[PDB]
PDB file of N, CA and C and ligand atoms in Angstrom:
ATOM      1  N   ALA A   1      10.761 243.198  50.876  1.00  0.00           N
ATOM      2  CA  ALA A   1       9.354 243.064  50.552  1.00  0.00           C
ATOM      3  C   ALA A   1       9.040 241.592  50.518  1.00  0.00           C
ATOM      4  N   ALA A   2       9.140 240.912  49.371  1.00  0.00           N
ATOM      5  CA  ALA A   2       8.885 239.479  49.295  1.00  0.00           C
ATOM      6  C   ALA A   2       9.899 238.872  48.349  1.00  0.00           C
ATOM      7  N   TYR A   3      10.167 237.592  48.489  1.00  0.00           N
ATOM      8  CA  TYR A   3      11.207 237.067  47.637  1.00  0.00           C
ATOM      9  C   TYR A   3      10.815 235.712  47.125  1.00  0.00           C
ATOM     10  N   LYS A   4      11.605 235.250  46.198  1.00  0.00           N
ATOM     11  CA  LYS A   4      11.327 233.981  45.558  1.00  0.00           C
ATOM     12  C   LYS A   4      12.080 232.846  46.239  1.00  0.00           C
ATOM     13  N   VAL A   5      11.294 231.895  46.715  1.00  0.00           N
ATOM     14  CA  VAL A   5      11.841 230.714  47.370  1.00  0.00           C
ATOM     15  C   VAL A   5      11.761 229.531  46.476  1.00  0.00           C
ATOM     16  N   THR A   6      12.877 228.831  46.169  1.00  0.00           N
ATOM     17  CA  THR A   6      12.771 227.560  45.436  1.00  0.00           C
ATOM     18  C   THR A   6      13.062 226.409  46.442  1.00  0.00           C
ATOM     19  N   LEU A   7      12.189 225.446  46.657  1.00  0.00           N
ATOM     20  CA  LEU A   7      12.540 224.362  47.551  1.00  0.00           C
ATOM     21  C   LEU A   7      12.722 223.116  46.678  1.00  0.00           C
ATOM     22  N   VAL A   8      13.777 222.406  46.915  1.00  0.00           N
ATOM     23  CA  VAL A   8      14.100 221.121  46.283  1.00  0.00           C
ATOM     24  C   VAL A   8      13.664 220.051  47.260  1.00  0.00           C
ATOM     25  N   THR A   9      12.453 219.475  47.019  1.00  0.00           N
ATOM     26  CA  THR A   9      11.969 218.439  47.933  1.00  0.00           C
ATOM     27  C   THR A   9      12.107 217.075  47.313  1.00  0.00           C
ATOM     28  N   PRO A  10      11.932 216.078  48.148  1.00  0.00           N
ATOM     29  CA  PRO A  10      12.114 214.720  47.663  1.00  0.00           C
ATOM     30  C   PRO A  10      11.275 214.296  46.470  1.00  0.00           C
ATOM     31  N   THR A  11      10.121 214.883  46.408  1.00  0.00           N
ATOM     32  CA  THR A  11       9.209 214.538  45.367  1.00  0.00           C
ATOM     33  C   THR A  11       9.139 215.642  44.316  1.00  0.00           C
ATOM     34  N   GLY A  12      10.062 216.615  44.344  1.00  0.00           N
ATOM     35  CA  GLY A  12       9.906 217.681  43.337  1.00  0.00           C
ATOM     36  C   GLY A  12      10.202 219.114  43.752  1.00  0.00           C
ATOM     37  N   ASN A  13      10.605 219.951  42.808  1.00  0.00           N
ATOM     38  CA  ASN A  13      10.868 221.366  43.072  1.00  0.00           C
ATOM     39  C   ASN A  13       9.556 222.170  43.163  1.00  0.00           C
ATOM     40  N   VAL A  14       9.458 223.150  44.029  1.00  0.00           N
ATOM     41  CA  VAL A  14       8.238 223.937  44.079  1.00  0.00           C
ATOM     42  C   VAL A  14       8.723 225.382  44.361  1.00  0.00           C
ATOM     43  N   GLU A  15       8.118 226.390  43.746  1.00  0.00           N
ATOM     44  CA  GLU A  15       8.507 227.809  44.019  1.00  0.00           C
ATOM     45  C   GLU A  15       7.307 228.589  44.563  1.00  0.00           C
ATOM     46  N   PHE A  16       7.566 229.683  45.234  1.00  0.00           N
ATOM     47  CA  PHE A  16       6.488 230.539  45.768  1.00  0.00           C
ATOM     48  C   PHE A  16       7.143 231.812  46.317  1.00  0.00           C
ATOM     49  N   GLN A  17       6.373 232.892  46.346  1.00  0.00           N
ATOM     50  CA  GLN A  17       6.871 234.199  46.852  1.00  0.00           C
ATOM     51  C   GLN A  17       6.693 234.265  48.383  1.00  0.00           C
ATOM     52  N   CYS A  18       7.725 234.745  49.089  1.00  0.00           N
ATOM     53  CA  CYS A  18       7.689 234.820  50.579  1.00  0.00           C
ATOM     54  C   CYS A  18       8.103 236.172  51.085  1.00  0.00           C
ATOM     55  N   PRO A  19       7.175 236.748  51.843  1.00  0.00           N
ATOM     56  CA  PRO A  19       7.376 238.042  52.477  1.00  0.00           C
ATOM     57  C   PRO A  19       8.489 237.875  53.484  1.00  0.00           C
ATOM     58  N   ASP A  20       9.313 238.921  53.574  1.00  0.00           N
ATOM     59  CA  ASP A  20      10.479 238.963  54.424  1.00  0.00           C
ATOM     60  C   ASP A  20      10.133 238.902  55.896  1.00  0.00           C
ATOM     61  N   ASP A  21       8.813 238.975  56.157  1.00  0.00           N
ATOM     62  CA  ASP A  21       8.378 238.886  57.529  1.00  0.00           C
ATOM     63  C   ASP A  21       7.643 237.618  57.821  1.00  0.00           C
ATOM     64  N   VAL A  22       7.846 236.560  57.048  1.00  0.00           N
ATOM     65  CA  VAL A  22       7.122 235.307  57.344  1.00  0.00           C
ATOM     66  C   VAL A  22       8.133 234.170  57.248  1.00  0.00           C
ATOM     67  N   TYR A  23       8.082 233.248  58.200  1.00  0.00           N
ATOM     68  CA  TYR A  23       9.024 232.152  58.153  1.00  0.00           C
ATOM     69  C   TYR A  23       8.752 231.296  56.917  1.00  0.00           C
ATOM     70  N   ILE A  24       9.847 230.733  56.399  1.00  0.00           N
ATOM     71  CA  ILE A  24       9.827 229.827  55.249  1.00  0.00           C
ATOM     72  C   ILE A  24       8.741 228.730  55.407  1.00  0.00           C
ATOM     73  N   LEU A  25       8.753 228.026  56.545  1.00  0.00           N
ATOM     74  CA  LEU A  25       7.807 226.954  56.745  1.00  0.00           C
ATOM     75  C   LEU A  25       6.370 227.389  56.625  1.00  0.00           C
ATOM     76  N   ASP A  26       6.040 228.482  57.364  1.00  0.00           N
ATOM     77  CA  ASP A  26       4.655 229.019  57.353  1.00  0.00           C
ATOM     78  C   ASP A  26       4.180 229.382  55.955  1.00  0.00           C
ATOM     79  N   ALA A  27       5.088 230.087  55.246  1.00  0.00           N
ATOM     80  CA  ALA A  27       4.814 230.490  53.828  1.00  0.00           C
ATOM     81  C   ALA A  27       4.537 229.272  52.946  1.00  0.00           C
ATOM     82  N   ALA A  28       5.400 228.248  53.082  1.00  0.00           N
ATOM     83  CA  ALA A  28       5.192 227.031  52.331  1.00  0.00           C
ATOM     84  C   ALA A  28       3.832 226.374  52.640  1.00  0.00           C
ATOM     85  N   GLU A  29       3.480 226.358  53.941  1.00  0.00           N
ATOM     86  CA  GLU A  29       2.215 225.755  54.373  1.00  0.00           C
ATOM     87  C   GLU A  29       1.011 226.383  53.694  1.00  0.00           C
ATOM     88  N   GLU A  30       1.056 227.711  53.752  1.00  0.00           N
ATOM     89  CA  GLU A  30       0.095 228.643  53.138  1.00  0.00           C
ATOM     90  C   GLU A  30      -0.154 228.399  51.636  1.00  0.00           C
ATOM     91  N   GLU A  31       0.881 227.955  50.936  1.00  0.00           N
ATOM     92  CA  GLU A  31       0.825 227.594  49.543  1.00  0.00           C
ATOM     93  C   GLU A  31       0.347 226.151  49.362  1.00  0.00           C
ATOM     94  N   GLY A  32       0.121 225.427  50.483  1.00  0.00           N
ATOM     95  CA  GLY A  32      -0.336 224.045  50.427  1.00  0.00           C
ATOM     96  C   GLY A  32       0.720 222.988  50.349  1.00  0.00           C
ATOM     97  N   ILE A  33       1.958 223.312  50.761  1.00  0.00           N
ATOM     98  CA  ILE A  33       3.094 222.381  50.723  1.00  0.00           C
ATOM     99  C   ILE A  33       3.247 221.631  52.055  1.00  0.00           C
ATOM    100  N   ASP A  34       3.475 220.329  52.036  1.00  0.00           N
ATOM    101  CA  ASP A  34       3.668 219.630  53.297  1.00  0.00           C
ATOM    102  C   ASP A  34       5.148 219.439  53.609  1.00  0.00           C
ATOM    103  N   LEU A  35       5.638 220.106  54.647  1.00  0.00           N
ATOM    104  CA  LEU A  35       7.020 219.996  55.061  1.00  0.00           C
ATOM    105  C   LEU A  35       7.106 219.350  56.470  1.00  0.00           C
ATOM    106  N   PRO A  36       8.151 218.687  56.765  1.00  0.00           N
ATOM    107  CA  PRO A  36       8.197 218.156  58.139  1.00  0.00           C
ATOM    108  C   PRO A  36       8.434 219.241  59.210  1.00  0.00           C
ATOM    109  N   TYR A  37       7.873 218.935  60.379  1.00  0.00           N
ATOM    110  CA  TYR A  37       8.158 219.763  61.533  1.00  0.00           C
ATOM    111  C   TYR A  37       7.769 219.027  62.824  1.00  0.00           C
ATOM    112  N   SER A  38       8.209 219.577  63.962  1.00  0.00           N
ATOM    113  CA  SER A  38       7.799 219.054  65.262  1.00  0.00           C
ATOM    114  C   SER A  38       7.560 220.192  66.306  1.00  0.00           C
ATOM    115  N   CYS A  39       8.662 220.741  66.853  1.00  0.00           N
ATOM    116  CA  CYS A  39       8.570 221.764  67.891  1.00  0.00           C
ATOM    117  C   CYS A  39       8.106 223.106  67.379  1.00  0.00           C
ATOM    118  N   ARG A  40       8.450 223.438  66.098  1.00  0.00           N
ATOM    119  CA  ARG A  40       8.072 224.774  65.554  1.00  0.00           C
ATOM    120  C   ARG A  40       8.711 225.918  66.378  1.00  0.00           C
ATOM    121  N   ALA A  41       9.727 225.654  67.217  1.00  0.00           N
ATOM    122  CA  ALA A  41      10.275 226.763  68.020  1.00  0.00           C
ATOM    123  C   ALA A  41      11.777 226.921  67.817  1.00  0.00           C
ATOM    124  N   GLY A  42      12.395 226.377  66.732  1.00  0.00           N
ATOM    125  CA  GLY A  42      13.877 226.467  66.551  1.00  0.00           C
ATOM    126  C   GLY A  42      14.816 225.709  67.524  1.00  0.00           C
ATOM    127  N   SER A  43      14.282 224.616  68.106  1.00  0.00           N
ATOM    128  CA  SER A  43      15.163 223.995  68.998  1.00  0.00           C
ATOM    129  C   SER A  43      15.375 222.544  68.656  1.00  0.00           C
ATOM    130  N   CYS A  44      14.951 222.134  67.452  1.00  0.00           N
ATOM    131  CA  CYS A  44      15.126 220.730  67.128  1.00  0.00           C
ATOM    132  C   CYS A  44      15.654 220.460  65.698  1.00  0.00           C
ATOM    133  N   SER A  45      15.884 219.186  65.259  1.00  0.00           N
ATOM    134  CA  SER A  45      16.416 218.958  63.901  1.00  0.00           C
ATOM    135  C   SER A  45      15.313 218.636  62.888  1.00  0.00           C
ATOM    136  N   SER A  46      14.086 218.510  63.364  1.00  0.00           N
ATOM    137  CA  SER A  46      13.061 218.058  62.468  1.00  0.00           C
ATOM    138  C   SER A  46      12.871 218.812  61.154  1.00  0.00           C
ATOM    139  N   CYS A  47      12.853 220.141  61.158  1.00  0.00           N
ATOM    140  CA  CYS A  47      12.523 220.882  59.956  1.00  0.00           C
ATOM    141  C   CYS A  47      13.803 221.257  59.177  1.00  0.00           C
ATOM    142  N   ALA A  48      14.878 220.586  59.468  1.00  0.00           N
ATOM    143  CA  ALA A  48      16.199 220.940  58.827  1.00  0.00           C
ATOM    144  C   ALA A  48      16.180 220.825  57.288  1.00  0.00           C
ATOM    145  N   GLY A  49      16.903 221.771  56.742  1.00  0.00           N
ATOM    146  CA  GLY A  49      17.195 221.842  55.306  1.00  0.00           C
ATOM    147  C   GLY A  49      18.698 222.287  55.127  1.00  0.00           C
ATOM    148  N   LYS A  50      19.133 222.341  53.823  1.00  0.00           N
ATOM    149  CA  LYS A  50      20.526 222.791  53.445  1.00  0.00           C
ATOM    150  C   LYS A  50      20.323 223.972  52.417  1.00  0.00           C
ATOM    151  N   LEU A  51      20.873 225.146  52.777  1.00  0.00           N
ATOM    152  CA  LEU A  51      20.769 226.360  51.924  1.00  0.00           C
ATOM    153  C   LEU A  51      21.816 226.164  50.759  1.00  0.00           C
ATOM    154  N   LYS A  52      21.296 226.175  49.572  1.00  0.00           N
ATOM    155  CA  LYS A  52      22.109 226.014  48.386  1.00  0.00           C
ATOM    156  C   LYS A  52      22.575 227.372  47.812  1.00  0.00           C
ATOM    157  N   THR A  53      21.648 228.299  47.755  1.00  0.00           N
ATOM    158  CA  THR A  53      21.927 229.635  47.204  1.00  0.00           C
ATOM    159  C   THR A  53      21.157 230.755  47.898  1.00  0.00           C
ATOM    160  N   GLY A  54      21.766 231.892  48.167  1.00  0.00           N
ATOM    161  CA  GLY A  54      21.009 232.972  48.794  1.00  0.00           C
ATOM    162  C   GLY A  54      21.434 233.247  50.290  1.00  0.00           C
ATOM    163  N   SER A  55      20.679 234.127  50.969  1.00  0.00           N
ATOM    164  CA  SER A  55      20.934 234.500  52.343  1.00  0.00           C
ATOM    165  C   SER A  55      19.639 234.376  53.168  1.00  0.00           C
ATOM    166  N   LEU A  56      19.807 234.098  54.446  1.00  0.00           N
ATOM    167  CA  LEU A  56      18.681 233.948  55.392  1.00  0.00           C
ATOM    168  C   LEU A  56      18.977 234.641  56.714  1.00  0.00           C
ATOM    169  N   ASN A  57      17.927 234.941  57.451  1.00  0.00           N
ATOM    170  CA  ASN A  57      18.075 235.448  58.828  1.00  0.00           C
ATOM    171  C   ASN A  57      17.562 234.331  59.747  1.00  0.00           C
ATOM    172  N   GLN A  58      18.499 233.766  60.524  1.00  0.00           N
ATOM    173  CA  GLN A  58      18.223 232.622  61.441  1.00  0.00           C
ATOM    174  C   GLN A  58      18.361 233.011  62.938  1.00  0.00           C
ATOM    175  N   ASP A  59      18.257 234.303  63.241  1.00  0.00           N
ATOM    176  CA  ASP A  59      18.390 234.758  64.633  1.00  0.00           C
ATOM    177  C   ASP A  59      17.476 234.057  65.617  1.00  0.00           C
ATOM    178  N   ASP A  60      16.240 233.764  65.198  1.00  0.00           N
ATOM    179  CA  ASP A  60      15.312 233.131  66.108  1.00  0.00           C
ATOM    180  C   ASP A  60      15.638 231.665  66.337  1.00  0.00           C
ATOM    181  N   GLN A  61      16.593 231.027  65.666  1.00  0.00           N
ATOM    182  CA  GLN A  61      16.784 229.612  65.940  1.00  0.00           C
ATOM    183  C   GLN A  61      17.794 229.393  67.110  1.00  0.00           C
ATOM    184  N   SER A  62      17.783 228.286  67.873  1.00  0.00           N
ATOM    185  CA  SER A  62      18.794 228.138  68.954  1.00  0.00           C
ATOM    186  C   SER A  62      19.510 226.817  69.002  1.00  0.00           C
ATOM    187  N   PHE A  63      19.217 225.951  68.096  1.00  0.00           N
ATOM    188  CA  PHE A  63      19.802 224.636  68.124  1.00  0.00           C
ATOM    189  C   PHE A  63      21.132 224.499  67.375  1.00  0.00           C
ATOM    190  N   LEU A  64      21.308 225.041  66.160  1.00  0.00           N
ATOM    191  CA  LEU A  64      22.549 224.799  65.415  1.00  0.00           C
ATOM    192  C   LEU A  64      23.666 225.652  65.994  1.00  0.00           C
ATOM    193  N   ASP A  65      24.882 225.127  65.956  1.00  0.00           N
ATOM    194  CA  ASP A  65      26.092 225.869  66.334  1.00  0.00           C
ATOM    195  C   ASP A  65      26.605 226.730  65.118  1.00  0.00           C
ATOM    196  N   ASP A  66      27.495 227.713  65.352  1.00  0.00           N
ATOM    197  CA  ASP A  66      27.995 228.570  64.287  1.00  0.00           C
ATOM    198  C   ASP A  66      28.566 227.773  63.129  1.00  0.00           C
ATOM    199  N   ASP A  67      29.195 226.650  63.481  1.00  0.00           N
ATOM    200  CA  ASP A  67      29.801 225.758  62.499  1.00  0.00           C
ATOM    201  C   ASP A  67      28.786 225.121  61.583  1.00  0.00           C
ATOM    202  N   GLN A  68      27.728 224.657  62.175  1.00  0.00           N
ATOM    203  CA  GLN A  68      26.683 224.015  61.407  1.00  0.00           C
ATOM    204  C   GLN A  68      26.076 225.032  60.427  1.00  0.00           C
ATOM    205  N   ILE A  69      25.872 226.242  60.931  1.00  0.00           N
ATOM    206  CA  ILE A  69      25.314 227.349  60.128  1.00  0.00           C
ATOM    207  C   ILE A  69      26.229 227.627  58.938  1.00  0.00           C
ATOM    208  N   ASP A  70      27.500 227.689  59.263  1.00  0.00           N
ATOM    209  CA  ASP A  70      28.570 227.910  58.289  1.00  0.00           C
ATOM    210  C   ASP A  70      28.515 226.806  57.198  1.00  0.00           C
ATOM    211  N   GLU A  71      28.209 225.575  57.651  1.00  0.00           N
ATOM    212  CA  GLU A  71      28.111 224.366  56.775  1.00  0.00           C
ATOM    213  C   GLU A  71      26.926 224.509  55.804  1.00  0.00           C
ATOM    214  N   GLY A  72      26.009 225.386  56.189  1.00  0.00           N
ATOM    215  CA  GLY A  72      24.832 225.735  55.369  1.00  0.00           C
ATOM    216  C   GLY A  72      23.521 225.114  55.899  1.00  0.00           C
ATOM    217  N   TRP A  73      23.542 224.627  57.130  1.00  0.00           N
ATOM    218  CA  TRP A  73      22.337 224.013  57.728  1.00  0.00           C
ATOM    219  C   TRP A  73      21.314 225.105  58.065  1.00  0.00           C
ATOM    220  N   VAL A  74      19.982 224.831  57.916  1.00  0.00           N
ATOM    221  CA  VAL A  74      18.918 225.803  58.199  1.00  0.00           C
ATOM    222  C   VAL A  74      17.764 225.101  58.921  1.00  0.00           C
ATOM    223  N   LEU A  75      17.146 225.838  59.831  1.00  0.00           N
ATOM    224  CA  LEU A  75      15.890 225.357  60.478  1.00  0.00           C
ATOM    225  C   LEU A  75      14.744 226.145  59.873  1.00  0.00           C
ATOM    226  N   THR A  76      13.983 225.462  59.000  1.00  0.00           N
ATOM    227  CA  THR A  76      12.969 226.137  58.242  1.00  0.00           C
ATOM    228  C   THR A  76      11.810 226.762  59.073  1.00  0.00           C
ATOM    229  N   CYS A  77      11.580 226.284  60.325  1.00  0.00           N
ATOM    230  CA  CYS A  77      10.499 226.926  61.059  1.00  0.00           C
ATOM    231  C   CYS A  77      10.907 228.264  61.625  1.00  0.00           C
ATOM    232  N   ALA A  78      12.192 228.580  61.555  1.00  0.00           N
ATOM    233  CA  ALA A  78      12.675 229.820  62.206  1.00  0.00           C
ATOM    234  C   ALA A  78      13.550 230.735  61.351  1.00  0.00           C
ATOM    235  N   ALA A  79      13.413 230.569  60.032  1.00  0.00           N
ATOM    236  CA  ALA A  79      14.249 231.293  59.077  1.00  0.00           C
ATOM    237  C   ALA A  79      13.462 232.242  58.204  1.00  0.00           C
ATOM    238  N   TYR A  80      13.946 233.494  58.107  1.00  0.00           N
ATOM    239  CA  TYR A  80      13.385 234.490  57.179  1.00  0.00           C
ATOM    240  C   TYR A  80      14.341 234.630  55.971  1.00  0.00           C
ATOM    241  N   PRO A  81      13.758 234.721  54.770  1.00  0.00           N
ATOM    242  CA  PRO A  81      14.610 234.911  53.571  1.00  0.00           C
ATOM    243  C   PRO A  81      15.059 236.369  53.491  1.00  0.00           C
ATOM    244  N   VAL A  82      16.328 236.635  53.145  1.00  0.00           N
ATOM    245  CA  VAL A  82      16.717 238.043  52.977  1.00  0.00           C
ATOM    246  C   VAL A  82      16.959 238.402  51.484  1.00  0.00           C
ATOM    247  N   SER A  83      16.800 237.402  50.645  1.00  0.00           N
ATOM    248  CA  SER A  83      16.993 237.457  49.208  1.00  0.00           C
ATOM    249  C   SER A  83      16.314 236.237  48.647  1.00  0.00           C
ATOM    250  N   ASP A  84      16.403 236.108  47.329  1.00  0.00           N
ATOM    251  CA  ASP A  84      15.871 234.905  46.769  1.00  0.00           C
ATOM    252  C   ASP A  84      16.696 233.734  47.277  1.00  0.00           C
ATOM    253  N   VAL A  85      16.101 232.560  47.489  1.00  0.00           N
ATOM    254  CA  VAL A  85      16.921 231.454  47.971  1.00  0.00           C
ATOM    255  C   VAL A  85      16.449 230.080  47.435  1.00  0.00           C
ATOM    256  N   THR A  86      17.462 229.176  47.356  1.00  0.00           N
ATOM    257  CA  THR A  86      17.222 227.814  47.045  1.00  0.00           C
ATOM    258  C   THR A  86      17.587 226.945  48.265  1.00  0.00           C
ATOM    259  N   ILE A  87      16.646 226.103  48.695  1.00  0.00           N
ATOM    260  CA  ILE A  87      16.857 225.241  49.884  1.00  0.00           C
ATOM    261  C   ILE A  87      16.446 223.778  49.624  1.00  0.00           C
ATOM    262  N   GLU A  88      17.323 222.838  49.992  1.00  0.00           N
ATOM    263  CA  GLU A  88      16.985 221.391  49.906  1.00  0.00           C
ATOM    264  C   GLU A  88      16.304 221.011  51.229  1.00  0.00           C
ATOM    265  N   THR A  89      15.090 220.477  51.147  1.00  0.00           N
ATOM    266  CA  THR A  89      14.297 220.127  52.363  1.00  0.00           C
ATOM    267  C   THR A  89      14.450 218.624  52.743  1.00  0.00           C
ATOM    268  N   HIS A  90      13.790 218.232  53.851  1.00  0.00           N
ATOM    269  CA  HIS A  90      13.795 216.822  54.378  1.00  0.00           C
ATOM    270  C   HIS A  90      15.246 216.301  54.543  1.00  0.00           C
ATOM    271  N   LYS A  91      16.041 216.995  55.360  1.00  0.00           N
ATOM    272  CA  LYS A  91      17.475 216.643  55.557  1.00  0.00           C
ATOM    273  C   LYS A  91      17.816 216.270  57.012  1.00  0.00           C
ATOM    274  N   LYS A  92      16.790 216.150  57.822  1.00  0.00           N
ATOM    275  CA  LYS A  92      16.941 215.845  59.258  1.00  0.00           C
ATOM    276  C   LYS A  92      17.859 214.639  59.507  1.00  0.00           C
ATOM    277  N   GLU A  93      17.691 213.642  58.679  1.00  0.00           N
ATOM    278  CA  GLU A  93      18.400 212.367  58.818  1.00  0.00           C
ATOM    279  C   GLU A  93      19.883 212.462  58.358  1.00  0.00           C
ATOM    280  N   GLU A  94      20.279 213.595  57.798  1.00  0.00           N
ATOM    281  CA  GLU A  94      21.663 213.762  57.292  1.00  0.00           C
ATOM    282  C   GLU A  94      22.495 214.679  58.185  1.00  0.00           C
ATOM    283  N   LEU A  95      21.824 215.269  59.129  1.00  0.00           N
ATOM    284  CA  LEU A  95      22.444 216.221  60.039  1.00  0.00           C
ATOM    285  C   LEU A  95      23.519 215.549  60.948  1.00  0.00           C
ATOM    286  N   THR A  96      24.653 216.230  61.162  1.00  0.00           N
ATOM    287  CA  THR A  96      25.673 215.746  62.040  1.00  0.00           C
ATOM    288  C   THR A  96      26.295 216.964  62.702  1.00  0.00           C
ATOM    289  N   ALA A  97      27.095 216.729  63.791  1.00  0.00           N
ATOM    290  CA  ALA A  97      27.712 217.878  64.474  1.00  0.00           C
ATOM    291  C   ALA A  97      28.994 218.350  63.833  1.00  0.00           C
TER     292      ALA A  97
HETATM  293  S1  LIG B   1      10.459 221.975  63.995  1.00  0.00           S
HETATM  294 FE1  LIG B   1      11.949 221.996  65.725  1.00  0.00          FE
HETATM  295  S2  LIG B   1      13.483 223.558  65.133  1.00  0.00           S
HETATM  296 FE2  LIG B   1      11.897 223.577  63.460  1.00  0.00          FE
END
């Protein structure tokens, strides 16, 4: 149905409810949150975050390798929450292979 998203952003924590059928980024936008993005199509590092707690569905993304996913990397424009989750945002500059 919908779940609780906690985002840890540079300027502060913010929470909001997100339907299992809406991407994290879009939901955040809708609540009035400004998150970084560029392509909006899952093929770049711009909207990257690090999943701290919880599960996500990242099938629509195509840029990260299985290893990176395993490391806990997430592309917020292409991720659906499958449970409540905590995510650290604005991590593009920390990404490595
Ligand atoms: S903005 Fe490019 S993958 Fe999300």
